[PDB]
From a paper:
[name] (ATV) infects crenarchaea of the genus Acidianus living in terrestrial thermal springs at extremely high temperatures and low pH. ATV is a member of the Bicaudaviridae virus family and undergoes extra-cellular development of two tails, a process that is unique in the viral world. ATV is the fourth most abundant of these proteins. Remarkably, ATV displays a new protein fold, consistent with the absence of homologues of this protein in public sequence databases.
The crystals of the second form reached a 2.15 Å diffraction limit and comprised two monomers in its asymmetric unit. The current model is refined against native data to 2.15 Å, resulting in an R/R factors of 20.2%/23.4% and includes residues 22 to 270 in monomer A and 25 to 269 in monomer B. Two loops could not be built in the model owing to the lack of supporting electron density. The first of these loops comprises residues Ser46 to Thr53 in monomer A and Arg44 to Ile54 in monomer B, whereas the second missing loop encompases residues Gly148 to Arg151 in both monomers. The structure of an ATV monomer is made up of 10 helices and two -sheets, one composed of seven strands and the other consisting of two short parallel strands. As expected for a hyperthermostable protein, the ATV monomer is stabilised by a relatively high number of salt bridges (5 in monomer A and 8 in monomer B; to be considered as engaged in a salt bridge, the centroids of the side-chain charged groups and at least a pair of side-chain nitrogen and oxygen atoms of the ion-pairing residues must be within a 4 Å distance). Some of these salt bridges form networks, namely the triplets Glu29/Asp33/Lys260 and Glu252/Lys254/Lys265 in monomer B, another feature related to hyperthermostability. Furthermore, a disulphide bond is observed between cysteines 250 and 263 in both monomers. The analysis of the crystal interfaces present in the second crystal form with the PISA software suggested two possible dimers with a significant buried area at the interface, namely 1258 Å2 and 1087 Å2 per monomer, respectively. In the closed dimer the concave sides of the monomers face each other thereby creating a chamber with a volume of 8650 Å3. Finally, the two interfaces identified in the second-form crystals of ATV are assembled head-to-tail, resulting in helicoidal fibers that extend indefinitely along the crystallographic c-axis.
Residue numbers in the entry:
A (entry chain B): 24 to 43, 55 to 147, 152 to 269
B (entry chain A): 22 to 45, 54 to 147, 152 to 270
Amino acid sequence: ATNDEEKLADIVENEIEKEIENFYYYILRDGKIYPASDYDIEVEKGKRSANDIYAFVETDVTRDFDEFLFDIDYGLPSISDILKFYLEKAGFRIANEVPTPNLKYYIHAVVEFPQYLAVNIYDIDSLARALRIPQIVEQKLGNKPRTITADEFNDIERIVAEEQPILAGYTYDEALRIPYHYYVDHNNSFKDDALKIAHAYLQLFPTPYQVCYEWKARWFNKIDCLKLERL
Amino acid sequence: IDATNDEEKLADIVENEIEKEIRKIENFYYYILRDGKIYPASDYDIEVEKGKRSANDIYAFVETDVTRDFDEFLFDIDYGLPSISDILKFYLEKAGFRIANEVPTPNLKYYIHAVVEFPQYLAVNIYDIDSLARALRIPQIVEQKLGNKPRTITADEFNDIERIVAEEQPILAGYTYDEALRIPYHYYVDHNNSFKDDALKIAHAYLQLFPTPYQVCYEWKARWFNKIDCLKLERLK
């Protein structure tokens, strides 16, 4: 499992390196990487298959070191993406969505300006469980695979993002608002609550397979992530 | 009245600054002072912390978003509302409340959202903070939870109010505020057509109930911004 994740991080890193503009990518089961937008056009043309998508890559670019560290350590994935990814992997189909049923990984790549790259690899199922998605989908839709309406997607989305406490008694939307307030907006009044959320997040949410690199002489050079966090 | 004159002045202040920045993507947040001077917010906060500048002089807060996708640019123009956190903070402080040990901005009248499309276009959206807070039912929720007498509130009290405003009350076509942000994003930015009916319902309620921002648009043409009709803008690729 860790072997596949190391391979995926080098696939992401080589692509960012090659590029050094683009933010979203798909990694296929064969290890090929493509920008997500152009792949979606090929999928609908019938040229490429959505069944071949193995990993989804979201690239954030930063110029502030506090933001870079926050993104890599405490940054939450989009709840809309994980819900969509979980539903499709469980056999459901969302109206107007081409499903990606064999998606295993969610990858968040953060580039600090170039100076550093941090590649975070998450298992989608593990992430969906921590977001308390399976139980809500089961209570609301059942187990029988079907196409769900936009209204049904929205009803589930509301519960998971706004109604269910996930971290230190807070909902997903409060857990986006409160930490960022302290960590990125540098507002000290939200220290107590941000730290409570941070502490719960680190234990309850799946630890990502994290690979770090430093930009030196036209290359990204693999380094210990602790060195990045310690600088 | 003179509100429209002030808003036109504010949009040219923002435009002049984005233009100045392009000719030399550096700063995303700014303050506009009551004298019309514009400063990056991060630097200004340090000058306040030093006793050089006063948070009392802040008249408008500017948030600049930069985009490279036309659909996202149009969505940000049409639905680029200020952060709930910001409007609540701005309303509380303007009403005399103090949030824990944080430095208040009591004389803030406007929230400005500037969107730059890559450079090709600039759209400046000016929101009146009071009008926005009222449409969000912020005064009624603050009154029910804190009372009418201003005092210092805890971070927990701020959070409790924020949760009701954004995640509990049906504010637009029966949806909570957070659903009202997500549904049109799903329709316009995620390009999912099944979300059309709900997005249009929210759009209709939003255009009726919420205050219309004063919107000013510009096209980048030969090292300068040049005025353009905003509705002409939505036709451009």
